[PDB]
Amino acid sequence: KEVRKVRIALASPEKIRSWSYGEVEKPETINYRTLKPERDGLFDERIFGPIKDYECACGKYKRQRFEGKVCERCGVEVTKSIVRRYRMGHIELATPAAHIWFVKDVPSKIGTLLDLSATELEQVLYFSKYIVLDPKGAILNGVPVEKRQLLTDEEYRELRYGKQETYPLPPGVDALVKDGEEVVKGQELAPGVVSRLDGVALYRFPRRVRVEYVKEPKDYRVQPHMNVVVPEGARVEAGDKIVAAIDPEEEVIAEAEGVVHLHEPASILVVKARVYPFEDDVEVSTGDRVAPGDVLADGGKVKSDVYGRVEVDLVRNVVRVVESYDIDARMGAEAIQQLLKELDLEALEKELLEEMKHPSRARRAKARKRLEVVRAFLDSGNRPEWMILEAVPVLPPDLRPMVQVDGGRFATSDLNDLYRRLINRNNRLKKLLAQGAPEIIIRNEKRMLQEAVDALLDNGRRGAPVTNPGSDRPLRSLTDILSGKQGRFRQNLLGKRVDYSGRSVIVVGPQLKLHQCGLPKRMALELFKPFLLKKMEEKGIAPNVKAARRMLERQRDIKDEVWDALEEVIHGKVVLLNRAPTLHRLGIQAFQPVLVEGQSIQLHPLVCEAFNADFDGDQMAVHVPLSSFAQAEARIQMLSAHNLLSPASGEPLAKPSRDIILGLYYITQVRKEKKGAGLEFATPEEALAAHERGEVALNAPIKVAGRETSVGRLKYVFANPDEALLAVAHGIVDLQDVVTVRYMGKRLETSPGRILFARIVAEAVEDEKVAWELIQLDVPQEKNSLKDLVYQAFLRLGMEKTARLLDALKYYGFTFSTTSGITIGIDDAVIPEEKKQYLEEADRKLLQIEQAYEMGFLTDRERYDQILQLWTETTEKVTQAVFKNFEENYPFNPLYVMAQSGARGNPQQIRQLCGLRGLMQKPSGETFEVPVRSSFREGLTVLEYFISSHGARKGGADTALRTADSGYLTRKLVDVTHEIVVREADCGTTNYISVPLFQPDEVTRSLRLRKRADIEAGLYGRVLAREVEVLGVRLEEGRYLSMDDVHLLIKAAEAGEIQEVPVRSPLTCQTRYGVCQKCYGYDLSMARPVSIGEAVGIVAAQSIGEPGTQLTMRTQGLPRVIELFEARRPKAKAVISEIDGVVRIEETEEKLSVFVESEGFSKEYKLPKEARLLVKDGDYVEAGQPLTRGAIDPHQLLEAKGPEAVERYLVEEIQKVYRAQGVKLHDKHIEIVVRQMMKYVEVTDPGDSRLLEGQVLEKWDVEALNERLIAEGKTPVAWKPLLMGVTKSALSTKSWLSAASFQNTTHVLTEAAIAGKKDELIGLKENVILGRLIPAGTGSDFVRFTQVVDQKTLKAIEEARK
């Protein structure tokens, strides 16, 4: 069968014993000399199976013939050794031990069921306070003892063994109270010591005995080794023994008849007891417990009158009943187990339902939590008493191996040590119980057993972590194995090490195609080793596979035909290149390997930006897909030439880069001269003749008669591009000169470089007209123009022609950057003549400010602010001067060309190289008053360098502490939206979102058109929900909005015809466990409608998390994004109006108050004094509209306006941060993540359902329950929308596997085990953990069952069937 669901539930002791093949009774692991496992040990062959396949311990059966047989001599079953990895054991605990996962995991589930606090549960479990299970008529301090009452050690001893005290008398003094007399509290016993409790007083050690002979008060002295054997006031006849001693020589006897009197006791024992004299034999014995009315002695004549412990004193021959109660009080996990057994879940559920109606909110919340736990136990079918372990399971020994390394040393895991400690403590407890150890020792050993069980289950959670003696390293328990970044889930389940994988340093390959990479010969031989062996076997290179492998083992034994065979193997196959970190989905790309001589991987330049890979020492990994499915997926979906557009924004990602852009811009830029630059003539011949006279330059802009042209456009008229480029080759004209060409029947006035670029595009796309329509010939080719050209080529031609154009552009750009002559010199950083003047003006203004400050016209703070403003203005002016100097005097300056073309550098860096470094910041954040007036070309001073080092180190630390946060946020986004897949073509929903085209600017307080980039990010590749009529164009419902449609909508908005665009979005998608094709829109990586089965959730998470590193960190930047995704309450939260109305300001010196007034309601908000109010008197504010500048609390906005408003606010605020950094990200991803955030609701009115008020569930589930209740006429469940962060939403998912593998593994696992949650394997993480086919991509049910058949076989089937 096929695994479809995974169920986790509590394991009963009977089930645990059923799992085990035998009880592990000894802690011995292996023998030290023979190295064989010891019998009944942690590694016993009799329990966990044989060490080697088909071989018993006794060495009698050694073959597969006796398969499934258990040897009679040794007991080891004759089977495969691999069962050693799968056969478990069990340890039968002498006393029950509570599972720590159900004790210290707040809220304590056992405590929740028993209504016991964490402290009380810890005290009871770890033997600190007793708990009563049967009072047995016990009265404490005048209050009868009730059940479930906690008793300390003193209280338990008082109730169980009675009250007793010992007062030690000083030597020599005689007690004032006779032996066997009742005394009251405060009564003096001896002259130096007084009693503290009422009871019978007894002599402990009489030091002197005073016998009164009758014929003589003879006295005898008693020593510690002598014991009196007669009572006080007893008649002793001559010869009777009086005092017994070790030596009969010193034994004291009576000479004649007398009366024995005891005197001088060592101490007095006062016990709260009743004394009964007796004459005949007693019916009871010492240690028993009696009740009033019970017979004690004399055959019923003497009857007990009070509960207590009975003890017979033969010396005084009386029966003492100490007043005590046979109270049943216990500690440890046995009492907890008994209490959980006694619970009736039905009665508890009924009581909790009754209590749920209490008006108190805290009472209702507590009842809801307890009732949720009870309902989980009831529905799961588990028993509460299963939470306390009676038999501890034992992991198979191969999962905790004791291996022998090649060096002879033994390596073992910490689980062996934990099991050894547990077994030792259990056996010691068994021995102590068998030996009748006292209560203290037994209690201590039971506490040790409980602590050992806790350490085995989860080490370090409670108390000091258990460490191996001789070191302070905590032992690795099962919880530590299964939790954390180094746990099983994140290290061996979600990610694994793979075979057929290599790694090497990458180098740039310009000669490679976009779909090719340079795989080294040795790496290809090692990675394709099995295929190479098969190919060598096919040919005559080797006789068989073994000979081929032996040949390949030695480097000098490899012939020359092996390389030819390897080349034959890799024909058609592709390999996956990977570079860590894989920030987005293009970090792994399929390339067609090309064998190269060397050891470094050759990487195509164009994909480098996709890989975020430079060639300063990067390393990349190579993986080899094996089967036909993997090869088809790599060649069709994962191919580098097939992923030309970025899925995040839809713009091209494999586009011309630094050197390519530099070369194309250099050739496509025209020359501007200044020789003539204005001279006007009458006829063109005059201008030409002046040109040969040298008065005017070739490219100098002149006027011939009325029009403005140049000498080049008149002197050089080329009939076709071939003649122009032939003249360029001969050196008559340059690529940067402006001449007249006849292209496509049009007399253009352009440069031969631009005509050459047009020809390049035409030859690359093999279509002159389309290529002409794609390019813009009137501007130099910068990065943006090349990107637009690539996108237009992708739209008009397809992937293959776009890849060909990309390769041609790369080749030509590289060649022209090589031959153009771009170089960086110290004089290329031109110092403007205006910098000195600006610095002098700044110095004069600073001197004026200082003089004014000395005059007292301004204070320190505003003087510092003015200095900062002055220096910022000076820096901006210097930047403008630098760029004006470049664009006027040196238009082809390498720094200017690189900055303008976008190949490298930004205006700030060009300023630092050419202008001034500027202001710098202190480590505390303040900026230095004096700036760094010297640039890098002039050279900084030591002090200026030290000042700049502060900012440099701050930026480095910011990047270091920001990369981890960005990665963790990306992990959260992946784990919360891992289940989102395109699962159907259309869900049929009628809801939508109105994307606004106008933003309400507050400085003008009016609607202004948003930026084109924002509208494109919010509308490109989206399905129109409603038909839109703009500019005579009717976009029907269900039409995908392309870039042309977005531009048309933008133009219509500019014409004032449309205010907002209604589009279908994932927020309004009704598809369960995913989205629909018509709601997602285009697949931005292909500029076509999304294919059904794509994992859009993972794509969205990666797209959002990739530019997290680029966001500035320094409520702004990446922390703002994090607090937005987590729905955290901002510290400087804004104040919003809960209800709509007219605003009224009551600003007073005492307090600041804002009133929202309505027809019958009036709300008051007490604002802080330093609040930047953005609303004035006489304004109409709506519900949720902010009143103070700041960050809106998402929960307050959701509760004030509604789910749509809070979703829109979240999307807009998240997108604002990316806009501020220049990163273009489509709103689909943010909307998907927000939809995942808004997936949960809270029940307010249970209605006709079993749900509880305040319970949090999924919106889809409650909607289904509501429609089901409506179908058969029942009161619907009232629910309130709930917003939670990505962490809380991911942790509360229905599938326990993904939640456990994400975070809080212990809590998720314990909740799932208690509730018996069954994982349906809906998302992608669970299938990854189980290694199944994920329900996305080729594994989606929509396309998984597609069948391909030829014509002939299909016709045969039809003919043979019909």
Binding site: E2, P393, L399, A621, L1333, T1338
Partner: protein
């Protein structure tokens, strides 16, 4: 590690990239056939050296270790089928 002649770590982020591409079969191979499916990897190697296609992969050993450790934590982890009947992924080797 190169010194120990080990493979390349295919961590979580690479799995996310494969899921984003939708390469379900490649991801399954890299999780089972090429990593820890003992019978699966042995059969795949035998098929490749024989010129045949690799067989369908099976349950990884890592999931078996997960199940056994969860059982050692006294948690009953059971894998079910469409009809909710228990499914033995250990091929009867752990059944008494």
């Amino acid at each position: 590690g190169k010194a120990q002649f080990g493979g390349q770590r295919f961590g979580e982020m690479e799995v996310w990239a494969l899921e984003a591409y939708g390469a379900a079969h490649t991801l399954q191979e890299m999780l089972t056939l090429k990593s820890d499916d003992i019978e699966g990897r042995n059969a795949a190697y035998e098929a490749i050296i024989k010129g045949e296609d690799v067989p369908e992969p099976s349950v990884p050993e890592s999931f078996r270790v997960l199940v056994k450790e969860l059982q050692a934590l006294a948690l009953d982890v059971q894998t079910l089928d469409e009809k909710d009947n228990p499914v033995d992924i250990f091929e009867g080797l752990a059944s008494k």
